[PDB]
Amino acid sequence: LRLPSPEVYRFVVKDSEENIVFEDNLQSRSGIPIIKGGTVVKLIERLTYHMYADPNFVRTFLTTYRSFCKPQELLSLLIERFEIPEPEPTDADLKRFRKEYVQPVQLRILNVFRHWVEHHFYDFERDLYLLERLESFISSVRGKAMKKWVESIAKIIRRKKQAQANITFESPPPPIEWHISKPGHIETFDLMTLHPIEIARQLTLLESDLYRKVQPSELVGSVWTKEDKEINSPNLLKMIRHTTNLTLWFEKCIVEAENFEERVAVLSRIIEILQVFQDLNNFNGVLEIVSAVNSVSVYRLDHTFEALQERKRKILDEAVELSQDHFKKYLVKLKSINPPCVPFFGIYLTNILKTEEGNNDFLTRHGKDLINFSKRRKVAEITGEIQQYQNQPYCLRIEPDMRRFFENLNPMGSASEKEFTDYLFNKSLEIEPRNPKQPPRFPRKSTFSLKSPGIRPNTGR
Numbered sequence: 001l002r003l004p005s006p007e008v009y010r011f012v013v014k015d016s017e018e019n020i021v022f023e024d025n026l027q028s029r030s031g032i033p034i035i036k037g038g039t040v041v042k043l044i045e046r047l048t049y050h051m052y053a054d055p056n057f058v059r060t061f062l063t064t065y066r067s068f069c070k071p072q073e074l075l076s077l078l079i080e081r082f083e084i085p086e087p088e089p090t091d092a093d094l095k096r097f098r099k100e101y102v103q104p105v106q107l108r109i110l111n112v113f114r115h116w117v118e119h120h121f122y123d124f125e126r127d128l129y130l131l132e133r134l135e136s137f138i139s140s141v142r143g144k145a146m147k148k149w150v151e152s153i154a155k156i157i158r159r160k161k162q163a164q165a166n167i168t169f170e171s172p173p174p175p176i177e178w179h180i181s182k183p184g185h186i187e188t189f190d191l192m193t194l195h196p197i198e199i200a201r202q203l204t205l206l207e208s209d210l211y212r213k214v215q216p217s218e219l220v221g222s223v224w225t226k227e228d229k230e231i232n233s234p235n236l237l238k239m240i241r242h243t244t245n246l247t248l249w250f251e252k253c254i255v256e257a258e259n260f261e262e263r264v265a266v267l268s269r270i271i272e273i274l275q276v277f278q279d280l281n282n283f284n285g286v287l288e289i290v291s292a293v294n295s296v297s298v299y300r301l302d303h304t305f306e307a308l309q310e311r312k313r314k315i316l317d318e319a320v321e322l323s324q325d326h327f328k329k330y331l332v333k334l335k336s337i338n339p340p341c342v343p344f345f346g347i348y349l350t351n352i353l354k355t356e357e358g359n360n361d362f363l364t365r366h367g368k369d370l371i372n373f374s375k376r377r378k379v380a381e382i383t384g385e386i387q388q389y390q391n392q393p394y395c396l397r398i399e400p401d402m403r404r405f406f407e408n409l410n411p412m413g414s415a416s417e418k419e420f421t422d423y424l425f426n427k428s429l430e431i432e433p434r435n436p437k438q439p440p441r442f443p444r445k446s447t448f449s450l451k452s453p454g455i456r457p458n459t460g461r
């Protein structure tokens with residue numbers, strides 16, 4: 001009984017469709033009401049509710065909130081929630097208010113701070129001032145019952161800060177495969193001089209590392225395509241730039257092979273790399289090669305595809321078919337394999353862009369910003385799927401020169417992506433013109449043997 005005036009404490013304005021909307025279905029019938037949307041004020045009140053704990057909302061909120069609220073604003077709202085004014089005295093009660101309202105709300109805030117530093121410390125890593133505000137506030141908290149919670153948050157922060165201020169094989173990894181390029185000779189590194197097995201291994205290790213660093217929150221609210229993308233989505237942007245560069249590198253290697261026999265040997269080696277990606281459950285790599293071969297500059301090279309060994313063309317068509325019918329066969333395959341694996345990342349992006357586009361950010365902006373929370377629950381269920389393959393490392397040894405090589409691929413050089421893709425298209429028309437004549441005969445500029453060592457481990461034995 002008796003809360004402060006909504007006038008002096010914004011959270012306790014009465015619930016109405018002006019400020020908060022609950023699911024009204026058979027699921028929402030039992031237990032804790034399900035939030036469909038509200039003002040950020042009302043979402044914060046329900047995140048820290050006096051009447052019950054809501055672990056599920058806390059988890060979904062801290063995954064999704066940056067799509068509707070800045071980290072600095074979240075901290076300001078949790079402090080505002082914490083600083084609870086006394087009710088209007090009546091002057092002819094406090095003791096109940098402190099036991100049943102204040103203490104439970106303050107404990108629930110400290111529990112949100114605890115989940116925040118435990119599972120989303122990257123917010124504080126990205127913003128040292130945010131951490132200064134949090135540390136200053138937590139150390140101001142003097143409540144007897146708050147003490148265990150403050151100690152717990154302090155210890156998490158101490159640990160996260162330690163594990164910032166600075167590989168272990170559970171079984172023998174395979175020996176590194178070498179072909180024409182030899183170690184230390186990084187300047188001789190090329191698609192055709194490195195071993196196709198080890199190209200697939202080193203790209204898988206790199207792609208696995210990029211994949212495992214992507215936080216769900218980098219995807220929520222299409223934040224990687226927005227103004228604050230370099231800070232909200234740094235891991236995702238690195239993974240997207242990697243995919244772009246590698247896909248364009250594969251295209252470049254094919255289209256710049258002017259000599260027909262060389263270009264066939266290049267496409268054949270890329271298909272061999274694709275088979276080792278498949279053996280490694282690197283569907284990310286499989287579908288990068290699919291992306292390259294379906295690019296307009298390569299797709300149209302009918303003479304090159306027709307010249308492939310039937311078995312190589314078969315393997316490619318099968319890879320290509322994984323992507324057909326909204327990735328139907330890819331999704332069957334992904335559910336059938338044993339990790340480690342690198343999921344095709346592009347499809348999470350596609351399905352989040354469609355959910356982001358097809359659902360309003362706001363239940364309405366008339367009179368109030370009424371945030372669509374249900375939209376964020378649906379995106380968090382998609383981002384949730386990214387997590388099940390981030391926990392299983394590859395049993396493969398890093399080749400530091402090859403890793404360096406692949407981290408630094410820059411097919412575009414100083415040109416724009418559009419200038420570069422125009423170039424690939426113009427070169428495609430040069431090497432295989434739109435006429436019915438046999439393909440032009442250009443000389444090789446490279447002197448290395450075209451003969452593949454194949455994808456049976458050599459040094460392995």
Ligand SMILES: Nc1c2c(nc3ccccc13)CCCC2
Pocket residue numbers: 293294298299300301302305306313316317320
């Ligand atoms: N252009 C292509 C041809 C074939 N497969 C292809 C597969 C993917 C992208 C382009 C292709 C089979 C042989 C004929 C041409």
